[PDB]
Amino acid sequence: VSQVRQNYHSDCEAAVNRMLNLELYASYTYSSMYAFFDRDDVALHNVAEFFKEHSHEEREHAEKFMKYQNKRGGRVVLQDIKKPERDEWGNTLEAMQAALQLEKTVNQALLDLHKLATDKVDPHLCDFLESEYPEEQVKDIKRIGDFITNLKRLGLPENGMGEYLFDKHSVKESS
Amino acid sequence: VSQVRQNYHSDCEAAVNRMLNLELYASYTYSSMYAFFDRDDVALHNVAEFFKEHSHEEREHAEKFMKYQNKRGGRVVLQDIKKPERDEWGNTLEAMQAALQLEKTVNQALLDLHKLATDKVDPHLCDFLESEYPEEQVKDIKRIGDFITNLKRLGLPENGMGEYLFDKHSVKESS
Amino acid sequence: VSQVRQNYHSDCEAAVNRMLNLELYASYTYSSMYAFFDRDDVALHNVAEFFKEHSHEEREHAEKFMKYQNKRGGRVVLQDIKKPERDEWGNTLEAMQAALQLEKTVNQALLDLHKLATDKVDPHLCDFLESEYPEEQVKDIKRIGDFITNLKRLGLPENGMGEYLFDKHSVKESS
């Protein structure tokens, strides 16, 4: 075992690798949503940029898990990054609904990792997870839910004017 | 009696305590409206912030009545702060209608206190009331009425797009 | 249930509402202490301002619980804010003793909420509570205890000179 390793269970090490992969998969999904909203026949560029930002933040989280793994003396083991579920994402409402579900999936994986860390009496891992994530993850879920509520109010999916307006007012003006 | 007391009738002292309580009750109502518009299934954050601001201003008025009471040599006597009338506030139009009524209630209480002060020949109290309030209170009533007119124009309660637009254009961009 | 809700037990949601109420009640108690020390026949204005500051901080904590409730998909349910225990607070020593007890009461309520969150395996709620509170709450208890020790050293309740001096040196110079 690594000379640095202390109080780091093999099961936790493995779960950290799986979380790293899930973050990479979430990044890649959000990148697909960006590409979709950038299409000439979609053309909602602030929505696109929102998803791009999220893609970059999830890749940053993956990198933090890599660094954490090494700091504890575990070993990074990479797997394929699965392509997203869909090739096209319908409209702003459907994409936001898919994002909500993705964020909930990631949150559940973090909850599960925290439970594992707790059961293995690893307070360092618990602190790490409670110091990069739960706050940020609940805030992202909240924001997406707020957006879904507003998209429904705006008459999505049918009301194209409403969709247009969402892109101008709800998401930050981009690039 | 207090060594500072001069020309301060017991009835006025009591009415000042009741006004303090009413201001605290109004604050608390506006705080409830904030919380409602912050809900994920409401999600009108500029509207929420408008109500939050109003909540803070009414608490500041309560504090001014406390200070006034002591300056005159009366004694602050606190009562329970009753919870708001409603737990949920419907939509922007219903909330604004409720605010209009609340503001009118507060204004009537101020009018009544001014009449009492007049009848007790207390020009200091009259001046105090005419120097923190009537101007500001009539302006708040006017603004809420203007908003109600605009919400009706925008098709509330049915027109969700209209509601959405009100939050972007009528109330100051927030937090 | 709310579209955002995940891993948030009904009992926790309810306990968050009760904590919100307790914070509002603590705020209101401290506001009463301010008003008392501002009286012309008390007249310890730095002491008064200390309590005013504490009143504002407890209201800010209540607002944080409101926001938290919504972020998790729970529903804010407000109750009456009970008036303080006393209408008059004796002197600096008695007020500080009452504050000590109030702070301990609030701390116990936070401890109890943390135990509940732990039992419901809600690390997000535990982190929230451990990230706004325990540090600050133990520091406030310590400061009030330090003050009580100093008030006793200064000869309270009998030694008015000592009381006078406390207001000039122990609490920050105010307004």
Next chain:
Amino acid sequence: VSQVRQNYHSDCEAAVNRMLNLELYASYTYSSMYAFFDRDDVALHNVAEFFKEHSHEEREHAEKFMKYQNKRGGRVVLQDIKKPERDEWGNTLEAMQAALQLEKTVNQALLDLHKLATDKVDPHLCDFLESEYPEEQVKDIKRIGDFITNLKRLGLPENGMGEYLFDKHSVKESS
């Protein structure tokens, strides 16, 4: 009658002259308190300066009544300025007690003038009185009462240490 005169009753004009005189008399009393606390066998220089400031503010009020009289088309009629009641003022507590009474006397004269103005249906005079005075006068009475409370707490008249401390901490550090 003066070409400017409108709605200005002779009785009000006369009462304005008497108020001018009372303000000059109050100024002169406070000047005597200054001189007393400046004595080598009294030697409380911050207390002295407090009274000096008050003397200057009351002379400024007298000048405002002069200007007001002319603005309304009345005629300034001066009388002797009576010397103060006492030649020596005992100690800080006795002087503050005398100031409290003086301030109350002035306030009562203002109240009486406001009642007269009201009875003569002179809103300009009422506004003038409510715009230079009641606020400031109640605040001065409050401050003096606060000081009396503190002087008693400090053990006046017997406790010279307490008196000494009051001059260092209660009144602004002077000249």
